[PDB]
Each structure stands twice: as C-alpha cells, then as structure tokens.
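[SOLVED] Need 3D model of a two-part complex

Original post:
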Amino acid sequence: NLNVLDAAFYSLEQTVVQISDRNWFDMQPSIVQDTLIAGAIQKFEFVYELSLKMMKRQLQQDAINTDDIGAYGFKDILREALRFGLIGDMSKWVAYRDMRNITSHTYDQEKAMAVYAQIDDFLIESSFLLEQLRQ
Amino acid sequence: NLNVLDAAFYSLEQTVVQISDRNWFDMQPSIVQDTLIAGAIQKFEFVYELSLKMMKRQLQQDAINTDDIGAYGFKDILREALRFGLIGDMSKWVAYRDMRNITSHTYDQEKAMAVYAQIDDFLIESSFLLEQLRQ
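Solution:
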C-alpha cells in the first residue's frame, strides 16, 4: 500500500516536470496542453486522496482507539496528524481539501490554471507526509 | 450553460482524437502518454457529471413547478430523462456511474486503460443526450 501512494506521488512529480519543461510544452497543440493539465489535476487528486487514507491509517495504528476519530472530522484528522508530526502545516491541507473539492469544476480552464498553480507547493507537503509515513 | 456541456464534450472528443493518432501518441514520452489518458479520464468525468446536471435541470425546469428535485436520486433522474426521450438506454448511464465511481482507482495504469477503453461508447451515448437537449 504505502508503495501505491509512493508510485502515485512520483507519477505526479514526473508529470509536473514534463509540463514544467516550458520548451516542449509551449510547442504542443493547445489540446495536448490542456489534457496534460487535466491529467495533472487528476494525479493530484489521487495523491491527495491516497494521502488522507494512509494518514488515517497511521493515525489509527497509533491511537488509544479508532472509535474516536475515524468517524470524526477532517480538521480533527489534521490536528492529530500534526500532533504525531505527520505533516507540518495543517493549513496547507485545509487548502488542499478546498482544492480537491473544486477539481470537479476544472472543465473551466481558468479554474484548471488555479488548481495547477498550487500543485508545486502541494508536492512539498505531500513529500513530507510520505517521508514521515516511510518511517 | 448548455454551452459548458457542449464544450466539455467536444474537448473530450478532441482529446480522444489526439490519443488515437497512434503515430503521434506512440512517440511521446511515457509520462506524456499516461498523463493524457489520466486527463481524458478526468474529462470523461466532467461530461458525465454535466450530462447528469443537465438532465436534472431539464426535468427541474420542464414540467416541474420546481418541486425541489432533491427527492430525486440518480435513478429517478435517469427514469425521468427516459420519460423525456433524453437518453434511450439507462442501463448504460447506470454503467457510466459504476465507471465514474472507480475513476478514483485510476492511479493503477490497468484500471485506467480499462476505463479509457470505454470512452468511445460514452461518446456515442453522451452525444445522443446532447442531441435531445439541443432541442
């Protein structure tokens, strides 16, 4: 499992890299560009959703009990994830959830630009998150 | 707002066309090939969702004295849409949702190929719907 989040993190990272190579990206027809952006938003969603689940799982393995939060709030998952040092800034994640909740609006190109602009930062935290989880 | 459904559809279609250009697509780097399939899948989700939003608004504005069509779930919307000849086979839209509900597993390349392969048919059906709504 953790391998899966790991494979999904890299594929996202790799994807931003290709899109970053501004030489090759600007050459491509516009439909190729917007499809890569969408594929990147889709890969963002995977890492985000896989991250929560791995994060919820570590949390359940380290708690006094799973009854408490696992049927309880996002924010509570974060604070707790923060306490065990799983993440560094629950404000990045509150933001990430806001991001994920609107990816379904991504057919609008502006909105797509807006989500893609936040992905590089996104890679940072999730990178941290996963490092934590490897240990 | 019919324009959005129309433009998401056409943008999907155009995505599928570039992907089918085997000579062009076989040359691309590995990460470009799958980001593109990732993206086409994301785009499939947009038309599906929008297509259902439109059947909904259609039935919601159509005969309804705006009877908070909330009492309505997926299958009522599909049944009403059939009553209006907006779709012609609901077993298919039922299957498009099962497809939609597994796209979150698309980080696995094989599951992703399996969903992408179903896009051609989706285009036929989704385009019929858009035809009826055009009137």
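Edit: The CA atoms of residues 110 and 116 of chain A lie 10 Å apart.
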